Amino acid sequence: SMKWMFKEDHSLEHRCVESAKIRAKYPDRVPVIVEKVSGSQIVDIDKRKYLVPSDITVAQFMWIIRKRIQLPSEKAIFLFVDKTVPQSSLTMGQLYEKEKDEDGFLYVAYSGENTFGF
């Protein structure tokens, strides 16, 4: 399974309130939690929390992550939302409305392989 440190560090109600707070303050931005898939052949990420405009695409968000972890261009990266790889052409706003957690955050896992899910 995916075990999210964000959810282990904060109660459901804490996250519900905080997600609602940023969405009220920044209605055109989506709060994203990013964590590495356990065991993956990829470096862990230093920045876990992102507030990204809804107008960037999934491909663009992947680029942001790749750059954060200094992943070489020739080396692949896969994102997973609820165990499926999202389509790169979607906007982060579309992804958020279709996959947001019960707590109002969007949880995106990343890996160097797509053996984890669909």
Residue numbers in the entry: 0 to 117
Which of the paper's sentences describe this entry?
GABARAPL2 (also called GATE-16) belongs to the GABARAP subfamily of Atg8 proteins. This fold forms the LIR docking site (LDS), consisting of hydrophobic pocket 1 (HP1) and hydrophobic pocket 2 (HP2). Once anchored, Atg8 proteins recognize autophagy receptors and adaptors by their canonical LIR motif, a small motif comprising Θ0-X 1-X 2-Γ3, where Θ represents an aromatic residue (W/F/Y), Γ an aliphatic residue (L/V/I) and X any amino acid.
The structure reported here shares the same P21 space group as the published structure, but showed a different monoclinic angle and is not twinned. We collected diffraction data from 13 crystals that diffracted to resolutions within the range 2–3 Å, with the best diffracting crystal, with dimensions of approximately 5 × 50 × 400 µm, diffracting to 1.9 Å resolution. All data sets belonged to space group P21 with similar unit-cell dimensions, and the best diffracting crystal, which we discuss here, had unit-cell dimensions a = 28.4, b = 58.7, c = 69.0 Å and a monoclinic angle of 98.3°. Despite sharing similar unit-cell dimensions, with the b and c axes permuted, the structure that we present does not show a twinned crystal pathology, which is likely to be due to the change in the monoclinic angle.
